[PDB]
Amino acid sequence: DSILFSYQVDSKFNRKISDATIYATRQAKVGKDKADETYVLGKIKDIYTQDGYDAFMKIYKKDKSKFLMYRHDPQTFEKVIEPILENPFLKYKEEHGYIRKYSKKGNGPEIKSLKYYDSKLGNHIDITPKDSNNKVVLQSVSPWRADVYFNKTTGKYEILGLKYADLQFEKGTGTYKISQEKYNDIKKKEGVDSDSEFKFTLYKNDLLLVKDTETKEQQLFRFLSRTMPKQKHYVELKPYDKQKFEGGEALIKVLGNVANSGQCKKGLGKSNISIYKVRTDVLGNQHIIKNEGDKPKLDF
């Protein structure tokens, strides 16, 4: 086990920034609510197929108040659950036709689809139009790289995270870059102090070295991403020898053990820690660096 590995680095900058699917949100009270919250909506596309009935009864056996018709047209929902008592929607279609709504007469519109409160809002991009009333978002926003900062007045590391959608074609010359003020906002949100020293930046499959300060241990990782964007400095790592981290396998003293799933989501924003970056040759000759340059690369 004196074998050396050699990986390939992924540092391309203009990739898929998000989905192209335009989602809708509402503000409502669902579940264990003490206030309103924003909910990404969903839709059952058609209920008379085999999939739409299964999705309907899944939502119905989870929670009945998720449906928007349950809150905005209740008696029609009563005439929706009278069929599900005695049989289903396909049988009603092949006997009586389309499931119309409640009305005085038989002249209400037909019911083919149903919206509900799908989930809570996570990472998004606010693309709300001018004359709109609720929020309109784009989901599935991917991460690109990390910038690692370090301050001396606390003696610990802080970690940034840039996405693909944090860059822009600019307004005078059409170059692809991020400004310095938006970068100051991203530095402020991630908790980096203004007077920290920029150490290096990490792409995917970039070899990381973690050393300790009290008990002289050494661990080597591969960087993946900048997961869990609610509390700070958490980094997802991968092994150097294999492709996975299955089990509650121990790594070093101060980090801990991998979770039950197999994912290594650690917090490197702590004291008693030390980080180097490894730049291998194509034959595997590991060269260790401590300072990359003077400033992070922002113009491409």
Binding site: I3, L4, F5, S6, Y7, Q8, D10, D241, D281, V282, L283, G284
Partner: protein, 514 residues
């Protein structure tokens, strides 16, 4: 003195190097890269062409705004009511007077949904049923009838009639929309005199205007590398003209067309040679005298030598029958043209008429290649029209392909073919980076994306190892392209090196020992 070994996989190469007189490991390593997925280029291409479609729809609406503002009908476009029924005004303006703002509404709605034009198989049956309906009305009348009868207008939707059920669809040809717009514009011209005939020609150009599949994107001052207006300042005529292949031995010359005099006389010569007087006799007989065929050619070789056709060795067979022999089919078919014959014409003019007629597949490309490439040609319009109908008449014969040779090598070789019975590879036998290794061969010879990636990353490993340590004599690869590549580089660099074709590192170490 040292032996190199490589184990090549899909996304990994394991590599090792030994000494073989002692048998200790000098180096071992594992190089890991992601796989060459072709699903990402399909995703990127699909999105680019969808973005072009969205762009050109919006530009049609912008061009309609510019045309309507330049001719002075409407001043501003902010007070236009978006809550009027466009099909009602489109069917009303066929006989009545549209009030100058509902005309803009009708024309904008008509340019938003034009039709298909590939027609001039359930989907084919539904669009033919819809054409069978539109032979008596315009499509605006059909859409208004569907609207005020069934409530629905758009998509594909099925309706149960009194005794039958039929699925409807919103697909009409472009000719019907053009006829309806021409009728509406002539009636409003009879009413409102600000819509001159140049307005009608400009609007119909916006409506039925499409690009050609051999043009591409771009404009005269727009300079695309995906279209005919190349970014180097020039202008191609057909973008599939710089994609035609090279010659087999001189890799800087364009190929020849299969349907000319030169390739066809070369093919009949190659099937005849496996002497000179009866070569020329059979060739002028098949060239000038008609009602020809392969069985007729074997009857004629029974005729002139006056024997039964025996001692046959040089013949190709098909699965069905036999007597596959080359003929002057294209030459004899180019003789039934009512304009002047091709016998007493040049070989350069014949071959470039064959080029122009083989590559271009429809009227405007054929026409402007005949007008633009034949310098000072001064061709008439009658022969252009009959060559258009001639190319339309033979698509299976004339769009055959392109001959694998070039006109330079074949003009080097057509006289020589006759005097001796000799074959092509023996005839060509008889006529005959400064330290690092190239990326020429490994970027050209691509069988798959996966093989291309893995072999080029392995060759980077190879040349890094030969830079670091020194010379070699044995290189092992776990095919023949990389073999003769390395063998010719090492003979040209005067080095006798024999190249022969955790886990992968160990396996490369093992085969380096083997």
């Amino acid at each position: 003195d040292l032996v190199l070994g490589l184990d090549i996989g899909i996304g990994s190469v394991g590599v090792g190097i030994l000494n073989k007189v002692t048998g200790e490991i000098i180096h071992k390593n594992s190089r890991i890269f992601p796989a060459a997925q072709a699903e990402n280029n399909l995703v990127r291409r699909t999105n680019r062409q969808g973005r072009r479609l969205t762009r050109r729809k919006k530009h049609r609406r912008v061009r309609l705004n510019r045309l309507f503002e330049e001719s002075g009908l409407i001043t501003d476009f902010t007070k236009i009511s978006i809550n009027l029924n466009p099909y009602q005004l489109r069917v009303k303006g066929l006989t009545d007077e549209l009030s100058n703002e509902e005309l803009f509404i009708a024309l904008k709605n008509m340019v938003k949904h034009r039709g298909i034009s590939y027609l001039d198989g359930d989907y084919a049956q539904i669009v033919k049923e819809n054409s069978k309906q539109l032979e008596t009305k315009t499509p605006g009348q059909i859409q208004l009838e569907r609207y005020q009868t069934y409530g629905q207008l758009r998509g594909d939707f099925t309706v149960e009639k009194d005794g039958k059920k039929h699925r409807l669809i919103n697909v009409f040809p472009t000719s019907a929309y053009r006829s309806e717009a021409l009728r509406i514009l002539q009636t409003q011209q009879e009413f409102n005199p600000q819509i001159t005939d140049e307005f009608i020609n400009r609007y119909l150009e916006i409506l039925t205007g499409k690009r050609k599949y051999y043009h591409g994107p771009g404009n005269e001052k727009s300079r695309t590398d995906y279209g005919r207006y190349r970014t180097s300042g020039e202008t191609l005529d057909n973008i599939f003209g710089i994609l035609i292949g090279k010659c087999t031995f001189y890799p800087d010359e364009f190929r020849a067309a299969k349907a000319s005099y030169t390739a066809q006389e070369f093919n009949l010569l190659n099937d005849l040679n496996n002497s000179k007087e009866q070569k020329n006799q059979i060739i002028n007989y098949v060239k000038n005298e008609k009602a020809m065929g392969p069985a007729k050619l074997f009857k004629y070789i029974a005729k002139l030598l006056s024997c039964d056709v025996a001692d046959i060795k040089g013949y190709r067979i098909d699965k069905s029958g036999k007597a596959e022999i080359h003929t002057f089919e294209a030459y004899r078919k180019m003789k039934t043209l009512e304009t002047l014959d091709i016998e007493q014409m040049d070989r350069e003019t014949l071959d470039k008429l064959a080029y122009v007629l083989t590559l271009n597949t429809e009227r405007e490309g054929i026409q402007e290649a005949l007008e633009h490439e034949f310098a000072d040609g001064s061709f008439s319009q009658k022969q252009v029209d009959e060559l258009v109908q001639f190319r339309k008449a033979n698509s299976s014969i004339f769009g055959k392909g392109w001959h694998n040779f070039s006109v330079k090598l074949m003009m080097e070789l057509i006289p020589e073919l006759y005097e001796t019975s000799e074959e092509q590879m023996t005839i060509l036998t008889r006529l005959g980076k400064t330290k690092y290794i190239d990326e020429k061969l490994l970027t050209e010879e691509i069988y798959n994306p996966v093989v291309a990636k893995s072999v080029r990353q392995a060759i980077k490993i190879v040349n890094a190892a030969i830079k670091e340590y020194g010379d070699f004599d044995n290189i092992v690869i776990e095919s023949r392209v990389v073999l003769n590549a390395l063998q010719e580089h090492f003979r040209a660099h005067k080095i006798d090196t024999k190249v022969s074709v955790h886990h992968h590192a160990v396996d490369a170490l093992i085969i380096a020992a083997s």
